Amino acid sequence: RARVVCYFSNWAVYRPGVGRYGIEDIPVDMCTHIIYSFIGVTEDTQQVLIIDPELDVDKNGFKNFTSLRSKHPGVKFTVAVGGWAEGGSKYSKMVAAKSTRMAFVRSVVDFLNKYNFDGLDLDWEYPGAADRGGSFSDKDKFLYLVQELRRAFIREGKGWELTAAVPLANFRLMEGYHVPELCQELDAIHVMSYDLRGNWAGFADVHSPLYKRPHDQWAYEKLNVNDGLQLWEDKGCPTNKLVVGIPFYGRSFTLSSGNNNYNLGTYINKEAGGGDPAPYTNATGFWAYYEICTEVDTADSKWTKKWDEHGKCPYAYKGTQWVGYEDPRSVEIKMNWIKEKGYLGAMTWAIDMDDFQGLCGEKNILIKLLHKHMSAYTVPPPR
Ligand SMILES: CC(=O)N[C@@H]1[C@@H](O)[C@H](O[C@@H]2O[C@H](CO)[C@@H](O[C@@H]3O[C@H](CO)[C@@H](O)[C@H](O)[C@H]3NC(C)=O)[C@H](O)[C@H]2NC(C)=O)[C@@H](CO)O[C@H]1O
Ligand SMILES: CC(=O)N[C@@H]1[C@@H](O)[C@H](O[C@@H]2O[C@H](CO)[C@@H](O)[C@H](O)[C@H]2NC(C)=O)[C@@H](CO)O[C@H]1O
Numbered sequence: 432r433a434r435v436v437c438y439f440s441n442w443a444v445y446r447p448g449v450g451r452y453g454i455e456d457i458p459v460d461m462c463t464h465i466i467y468s469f470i471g472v473t474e475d476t477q478q479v480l481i482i483d484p485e486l487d488v489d490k491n492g493f494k495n496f497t498s499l500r501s502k503h504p505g506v507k508f509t510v511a512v513g514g515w516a517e518g519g520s521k522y523s524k525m526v527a528a529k530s531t532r533m534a535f536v537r538s539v540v541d542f543l544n545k546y547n548f549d550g551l552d553l554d555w556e557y558p559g560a561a562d563r564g565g566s567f568s569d570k571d572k573f574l575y576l577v578q579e580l581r582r583a584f585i586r587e588g589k590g591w592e593l594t595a596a597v598p599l600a601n602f603r604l605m606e607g608y609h610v611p612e613l614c615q616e617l618d619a620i621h622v623m624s625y626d627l628r629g630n631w632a633g634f635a636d637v638h639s640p641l642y643k644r645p646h647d648q649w650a651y652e653k654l655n656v657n658d659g660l661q662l663w664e665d666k667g668c669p670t671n672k673l674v675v676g677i678p679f680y681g682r683s684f685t686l687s688s689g690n691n692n693y694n695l696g697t698y699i700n701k702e703a704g705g706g707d708p709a710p711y712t713n714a715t716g717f718w719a720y721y722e723i724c725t726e727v728d729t730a731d732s733k734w735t736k737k738w739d740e741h742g743k744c745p746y747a748y749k750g751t752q753w754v755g756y757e758d759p760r761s762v763e764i765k766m767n768w769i770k771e772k773g774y775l776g777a778m779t780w781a782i783d784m785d786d787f788q789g790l791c792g793e794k795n796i797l798i799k800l801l802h803k804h805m806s807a808y809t810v811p812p813p814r
């Protein structure tokens with residue numbers, strides 16, 4: 432009764448060559464809940480914004496995805512609104528008044544009926560975040576939105592789920608999330624236990640450390656997966672509502688000129704923006720898991736792979752390039768820890784970045800780990 436929650440990116444179909452990943456590539460039986468990402472909100476009318484209508488509607492992307500339930504009827508197929516690229520300011524605007532929230536709620540209900548989704552995942556990053564167009568009143572008003580969506584979903588009578596993707600840093604929780612009240616209204620809390628470190632921080636480090644390292648200080652002291660989940664519990668969220676995110680990607684850095692120290696915490700060339708783009712994701716500062724294993728794990732690789740003994744994550748480097756990520760060893764450790772803590776399950780950002788082609792070895796190696804552990808695990812009663 433554990434969840435394996437799989438975010439599916441609708442833009443992965445445009446990746447070239449073996450990176451192309453579409454609806455037909457989703458390994459549906461490895462997940463219990465699959466989430467089509469993303470739709471957005473309009474700036475002016477607070478309605479659902481379809482972000483790639485040629486794919487999502489004209490080529491039947493939404494419906495191809497939800498009709499997967501014909502062959503896989505025990506799986507839930509929902510849609511996520513928001514995501515990083517959507518920004519936060521349209522959401523802070525939409526929740527500012529009862530009337531604009533109600534316009535959005537009606538639009539959501541029509542959309543979910545039209546494309547036969549099982550519910551909605553809220554991915555506003557983030558209520559209350561001044562750097563993302565937010566402000567103080569978002570914390571109350573985001574809770575109101577959640578309460579109003581839940582009531583609308585109850586009225587529709589189809590048993591739709593409502594979930595949310597959330598951060599784990601204390602300051603973000605204080606600015607945006609009434610934890611006990613949100614955890615009561617939501618079916619699952621998808622914790623984004625990743626991007627905890629990255630180029631923006633100004634030093635090289637793994638981005639999903641499980642436990643504190645000696646160099647973690649001040650704001651970073653508790654910014655690790657174990658302490659972040661413990662924070663959600665301490666703030667009032669039941670253990671059996673918390674789903675732990677696992678990144679299928681690494682955060683990369685370009686090290687400072689002449690820097691031969693590759694240890695965690697080493698200085699970087701921050702203006703570079705991160706490591707150089709890899710060929711399929713083509714984004715400075717991150718690599719898909721399959722982009723990492725095809726470079727790091729080959730027989731003649733010139734990459735050097737190391738292990739963070741405290742954070743329990745791999746990192747690898749070559750030249751000026753350094754990347755921290757998750758591999759089968761680190762994912763196995765986190766699966767065992769999820770079971771030890773009694774959490775509701777595991778989530779991945781995102782299923783289209785697993786080695787789904789088997790370029791390095793077993794196809795879908797990381798999601799198979801999530802599925803192996805979660806499917807044999809019984810979630811205990813709240814602690
Ligand atoms: C649940 C959750 O993890 N949510 C967040 C994710 O949004 C975020 O991943 C990033 O998502 C954005 C989209 O919101 C990606 O930007 C996209 O970039 C490509 C080209 O580089 C572009 O073609 C797309 O148009 C654009 N998206 C859209 C909506 O069209 C970004 O690359 C993702 N970053 C990754 C995968 O590392 C994840 C991980 O950061 O965490 C939350 O912030
Ligand atoms: C903490 C900080 O300096 N904030 C900015 C970051 O939000 C941002 O990247 C993002 O890191 C967040 C953690 O703070 C993640 O939650 C978020 O998923 C991630 N963004 C994505 C999806 O790529 C960086 C810019 O990339 O700027 C920082 O200043």
Ligand SMILES: *[C@@H]1O[C@H](CO)[C@@H](O)[C@H](O)[C@H]1NC(C)=O
Pocket residue numbers: 453454455486487490491492495
């Ligand atoms: C939906 O499935 C149809 C029939 O297989 C296919 O032609 C189309 O490309 C699919 N669209 C998407 C977005 O996957």
Ligand SMILES: *[C@@H]1O[C@H](CO)[C@@H](O)[C@H](O)[C@H]1NC(C)=O
Pocket residue numbers: 713714
């Ligand atoms: C890679 O991304 C950059 C930055 O957006 C873009 O300008 C360039 O066209 C992209 N290249 C490919 C092959 O998509």
